[PDB]
Amino acid sequence: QIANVVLADGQAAPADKTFEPQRGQNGVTDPAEWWEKSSPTLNGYRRLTALVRRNAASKSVKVKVAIYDPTLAVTAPSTASGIQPSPTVAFTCPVFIEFTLPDACTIQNRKDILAYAKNFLASATATDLVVNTAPQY
Amino acid sequence: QIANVVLADGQAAPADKTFEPQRGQNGVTDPAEWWEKSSPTLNGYRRLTALVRRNAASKSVKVKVAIYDPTLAVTAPSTASGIQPSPTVAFTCPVFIEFTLPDACTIQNRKDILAYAKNFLASATATDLVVNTAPQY
Amino acid sequence: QIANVVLADGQAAPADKTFEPQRGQNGVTDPAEWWEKSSPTLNGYRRLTALVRRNAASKSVKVKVAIYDPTLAVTAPSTASGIQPSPTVAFTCPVFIEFTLPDACTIQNRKDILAYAKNFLASATATDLVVNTAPQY
Amino acid sequence: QIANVVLADGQAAPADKTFEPQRGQNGVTDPAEWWEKSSPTLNGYRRLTALVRRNAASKSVKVKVAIYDPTLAVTAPSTASGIQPSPTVAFTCPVFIEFTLPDACTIQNRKDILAYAKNFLASATATDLVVNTAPQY
Amino acid sequence: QIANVVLADGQAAPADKTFEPQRGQNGVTDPAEWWEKSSPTLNGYRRLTALVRRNAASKSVKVKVAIYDPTLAVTAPSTASGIQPSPTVAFTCPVFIEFTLPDACTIQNRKDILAYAKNFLASATATDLVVNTAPQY
Amino acid sequence: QIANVVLADGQAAPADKTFEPQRGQNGVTDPAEWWEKSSPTLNGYRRLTALVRRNAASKSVKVKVAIYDPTLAVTAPSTASGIQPSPTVAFTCPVFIEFTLPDACTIQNRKDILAYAKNFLASATATDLVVNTAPQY
Ligand SMILES: [Ca+2]
């Protein structure tokens, strides 16, 4: 069932960011969505989308997850020819994650694949890969 | 620099699977690759690919990671009209992970996004999502 | 083997700027690269590239080194958009250095040529040449 | 105006090599040139060229320096008794150095870039690079 | 990762020749290379290249190794007094070694084939073949 | 003169596999060949070919050696014909070795090059290279 999810950010001391749910997954067209509600306006909310859809062509199940972390732009009180500007997004950092699981697969295989993903993302080589934006020479 | 990466599988007690490197990332066309070497033939090797490529159109850096976990099929000593069969793959479970990081982003933003990914993948909602193949109702 | 390089800027009291290795050279095509990471964004990094490449045509070995020092443009919050733009580079100061070493080249000759280069660049005539942008009339 | 330049060669104790000014910088067309004039043949004169020219289109100042160190060779070793083989130029070790300084450039930026160049060339990584003939892997 | 390699030359008592790693294997494109760096000239460096690449079409792994031993020659014997003739490369003795291992290949088969190669090269028939320059009639 | 060659396979306790001479080399066109005769049928023989050939173009002498180790496919009585097929080869592991020896080549240089080859193939880096199919990263 759906409840908010708590993700610890990247710092010395992690600070838990809570994503409260906004949508349940309906059918396979619509993914379930979670919003952080940290900043005052919507543009500052961090987003989490998750969709489990069965693909009958491949006789398999797909799992798509997305994490959108937006950072707002630095504003100024005096905007040209008009009003003080509403807060806007300067850029946003996404993660996309896609698991695919065939129909003939084991519960053990699913646990294997998920643990491989989480342990790699913890691993220092993934940290080198994303934080330093560096290849593997 | 490149060294093998150790990922703990999904069990009661994790069993470390070691991926020894086979390729370094060359340019942006070619991703760096790691092979598990657990099974006797190649088809049983588990794979890990990682590529950091700068996309100049979006003025940003992309990071693509893939984990391929194949399970072999159950063979029989007597194959029709010929020889005992070589081990073949029955199916394979992949993860794909894509980070994108704009040029104007902070080291803090990169650490944030990676920690969000790893903490979610550890989270029980991600476990519900992949292991049980269940939506969020 | 690759390891960060520490160069001292020109001032009253010079400061050690450390170029951490961000990409190594394992092939002949693409040079090795070091990134400073003083500024918070990728644009503000100081760069150092170094390629050693055997040229079979001249039966020789070329060594190309480049040092890029960018001066980030002062970015103020927009007078028109009210929205401070992502940090940009107003201009960059490069050095390019090329050594060529023939196949019949003594270790002593290599030491000689590197010494002439470094001692000239330290020399007050090189200072008159680059710092004061003055020729020898 | 123009003055001869003395550089320390690479040895246990550096031996000052003096480059006499044999021609000064014409203007913006022909670079200034200095000649060591140590060897008895004109072959073994070491050379130094330096030119400072403002590219008005690019609104910048280019500074080009070159150091030419020749190594000679005779058909057969010298006897000091009869007519002996005149020496050929076996090879030449050049350094080329180029600075480019945009027109709206600080004197402090010029000092910075020259310092980065000279401190790097003194650095042991530059020594591993050029003297040892080994790239950074 | 990559480590220098020491080979015993042919003499009454073998003299260990150490090949330092001057460049590692790029990926699947450029082989790893090792340099002896014993002789004073760059001519007399002995070379070792090794590349391991999976041909995906042929479903196999190629392993290519090459050993380059140069022998130098001067126009006239050295005097140690005056300017002397720089040395030319008289000739080079290469070995090329290629293994191909199909994808469905046993680790025991790999051990077998490498053992056959090494034991043969140690064998006195290989010695009669290559050292003595005499075929098997 | 031709005589059988005895090579030791890689195992716990290595076994001497004897290649009996089955065809000698008396001409330059076709190499000499040795057959193992372990298996009962011709397909299961291990092969060794060796050609020493003077190349007048390069004023040199080439030596080509090849070792073919076939792994016979497990042949079970037909599931369809009920008739076990004649034994076939599922795959084969070759080694190819090429020495080239110029006309001006010292006996000592030949000993050197054969020694470098054999000692490298014995070397643990060669084992990491072929047995583990791993590059030098
Ligand atoms: Ca490396």
Q: Crossing angle of helices A107-122/B107-122, nearest 10°?
A: 160
CB C121 within 8 A of CB D118: yes
CA distances from A11 to A8, A15, B115 (A): 9, 8, 9
- Output the CA torsion sign for E77, E80, E82, E88: positive
The residue of C95, C101, C110 whose CB has the most chain D CBs within 10 angstroms, and thus the best one to mutate to test that interface, is C95
CB C17 within 8 A of CB C34: no
Nearest CA in chain B to C45: B103
CB C10 within 8 A of CB C17: no
Q: Which residues in chain E touch residue C105, judged by CB atoms under 8 angstroms apart?
A: 41-42
Residue with tokens 């090797």: B45
Q: Which residue type occupies F46? A: R
C86 touches chain B (CB under 8 A): yes
- From CA B101, how far away is CA A123, in angstroms rounded? 19
Helix (H, G, I), strand (E, B) or coil at A79: coil
- Output the CA torsion sign for F75, F77, F79, F82: positive
Residue A12 Cα to ligand 1 middle (Å): 29
- From CA F92, how far away is CA E131, in angstroms rounded? 29
A 29-58 residues inside an 8 A Cβ radius of B: 32, 46, 48, 50-52
CB B49 within 8 A of CB A129: no
Burial class (CB in 10 A: 0-12, 13-18, 19+), A43: middle
- From CA C110, how far away is CA C128, in angstroms rounded? 27
Q: Which among C125, C101, C135 has a CA at the least distance from the CA of D18?
A: C125
Q: Which residues in chain B touch residue F75, judged by CB atoms under 8 angstroms apart?
A: 82-84
Q: Closest partner residue to C61 among E24, E25, E42, by Cβ? A: E42
* Six-digit token string for A113: 């694949």
Tell me the structure's resolution in angstroms, rounded to a single decimal: 3.7
**By what method was this entry solved?**
X-ray
Task: Find the distance separating the first CA and the last CA of chain C, reported in whole Å.
Answer: 44
Residue C31 Cα to ligand 1 middle (Å): 14
CA atoms within 13 A on the CB side of A87: 10
- Is F25 within 8 Å of E135 when comparing Cβ atoms? yes
Helix (H, G, I), strand (E, B) or coil at D99: strand
- Is E5 within 8 Å of F123 when comparing Cβ atoms? yes
CB A4 within 8 A of CB A20: yes
Burial class (CB in 10 A: 0-12, 13-18, 19+), C76: exposed
- From CA E101, how far away is CA F91, in angstroms rounded? 9
Neighbours of ion ligand 1 (CB under 5 A): A 137; B 1-2
Helix (H, G, I), strand (E, B) or coil at B63: strand
Which uninterrupted H or E stretch holds B128? helix B124-131
CB A34 within 8 A of CB B120: no
- Beta-bridge partner residues of C61: C54, C101
Q: Which residue type occupies E130? A: V
- From CA B63, how far away is CA B50, in angstroms rounded? 7
Q: Which residue type occupies C69? A: D
Q: Which among C78, C26, C21 has a CA at the least distance from the CA of C53?
A: C26
Q: Which residues in chain E touch residue B45, judged by CB atoms under 8 angstroms apart?
A: none
- From CA F81, how far away is CA F79, in angstroms rounded? 6
- From CA A131, how far away is CA A135, in angstroms rounded? 11
CB A117 within 8 A of CB A101: no
- Is B83 within 8 Å of F77 when comparing Cβ atoms? no
- Is E28 within 8 Å of B25 when comparing Cβ atoms? no
- Is C83 within 8 Å of A88 when comparing Cβ atoms? yes
Contacts of B111 (CB under 8 A, 6+ apart): A9, A10, A11, A131
CA distances from C128 to C15, D104, E2 (A): 22, 18, 46
- From CA C133, how far away is CA D101, in angstroms rounded? 9
Q: Which residues in chain E touch residue D75, judged by CB atoms under 8 angstroms apart?
A: 75-76, 85
Neighbour-count burial for A100-135, b at 16+ CB within 10 Å, e otherwise: bbeeebeeebbbbbbbbbbbbbbeebbbbbbbbbbb
Residue D41 Cα to ligand 1 middle (Å): 48
Q: Which residue type occupies C135? A: P
**What own/partner pairs with CB < 8 Å and gap ≥ 24 does A12-19 have?**
A14/B115, A17/A46, A17/B116, A19/A46, A19/A47, A19/A48
The residue of C41, C88, C89 whose CB has the most chain B CBs within 10 angstroms, and thus the best one to mutate to test that interface, is C41
Pairing status of strand A5-8 against strand F16-23 = unpaired
The angle subtended at Cα B54 by Cα B52 and Cα B56, nearest 5°, is 165
| Strand-by-strand arrangement of the E60-73 sheet | E5-8, E16-23, E32-35, E47-55, E60-73, E88-102, F89-102, F60-72, F47-55, F32-35, F16-23, F5-8
A137 touches chain B (CB under 8 A): yes
CA distance B78 to chain F (A): 6
- From CA B45, how far away is CA B88, in angstroms rounded? 12
Q: Which residue type occupies B42? A: L
Q: Which among D10, D94, B112 has a CA at the least distance from the CA of A17?
A: B112
Residue E1 Cα to ligand 1 middle (Å): 7
Phi, psi of F48 (to 5 degrees): -140, 120
Helix (H, G, I), strand (E, B) or coil at D91: strand
- From CA F12, how far away is CA F14, in angstroms rounded? 6
- From CA E87, how far away is CA E39, in angstroms rounded? 11
CB C130 within 8 A of CB D110: yes
Which uninterrupted H or E stretch holds E117? helix E107-122
Q: Which residues in chain D touch residue E2, judged by CB atoms under 8 angstroms apart?
A: 137
- From CA B98, how far away is CA B30, in angstroms rounded? 16
The angle subtended at Cα C73 by Cα C68 and Cα C76, nearest 5°, is 155
CB D72 within 8 A of CB D88: yes
Tell me the DSSP string of C122-134. HSHHHHHHHTS--
Q: Closest partner residue to B24 among C26, C29, C41, by Cβ? A: C26
CB D93 within 8 A of CB D61: no
Neighbour-count burial for D103-118, b at 16+ CB within 10 Å, e otherwise: eebeeebbbbbbbbbb
- From CA D73, how far away is CA E86, in angstroms rounded? 6
Q: Which chains touch E (3 or more CB pairs under 8 A)?
A: B, C, D, F
Q: Crossing angle of helices D107-122/C107-122, nearest 10°?
A: 160
Nearest CA in chain E to C26: E26
Residues in chain F: 137
- From CA B45, how far away is CA A41, in angstroms rounded? 48
- From CA C42, how far away is CA C72, in angstroms rounded? 11
DSSP state at residue D59: T
DSSP state at residue A7: E
- From CA C35, how far away is CA C48, in angstroms rounded? 7
Q: Closest partner residue to B80 among F80, F90, F134, by Cβ? A: F80
Helices (H) and strands (E) in chain D, counts: 2, 6
Q: Which among F72, F23, F11 has a CA at the least distance from the CA of F46?
A: F72
Q: Which residue type occupies E26? A: N
Phi, psi of E136 (to 5 degrees): -95, 105
* Six-digit token string for E56: 């995906």
- Chains D and E form CB pairs within 8 A to the count of 48
- Output the CA torsion sign for C38, C44, C45, C47: negative
- Is E97 within 8 Å of F100 when comparing Cβ atoms? no
| HEC sequence for A11-37 | CCCCCEEEEEEEECCECCCECEEEECC
CA distance C130 to chain D (A): 7
Q: Which residue type occupies C38? A: S
Q: Which residue type occupies B118? A: K
Task: Find the distance separating the first CA and the last CA of chain E, reported in whole Å.
Answer: 45
Tell me the DSSP string of D78-92. --SSS--PPPEEEEE
| Strand-by-strand arrangement of the A16-23 sheet | A5-8, A16-23, A32-35, A47-55, A60-72, A89-102, B89-102, B60-72, B47-55, B32-35, B16-23, B5-8
CA distances from D34 to A106, E13, F78 (A): 79, 53, 89
DSSP state at residue A10: S
* Six-digit token string for A94: 């996404």
B84 touches chain C (CB under 8 A): no
- From CA F48, how far away is CA F97, in angstroms rounded? 11
C118 touches chain A (CB under 8 A): no
- From CA D111, how far away is CA C133, in angstroms rounded? 11
Q: Which among F6, F113, B83 has a CA at the least distance from the CA of E69?
A: F113
| HEC sequence for C46-104 | CEEEEEEEEECCCCEEEEEEEEEEEEECCCCCCCCCCECCCCCEEEEEEEEEEEEEECC
CB C55 within 8 A of CB A47: no
Residues in chain E: 137
- Beta-bridge partner residues of F94: F68
CB atoms within 10 A of CB C14: 14
> In chain E, which residues are followed by a C-to-N distance beyond 2.5 Å, i.e. a gap?
none
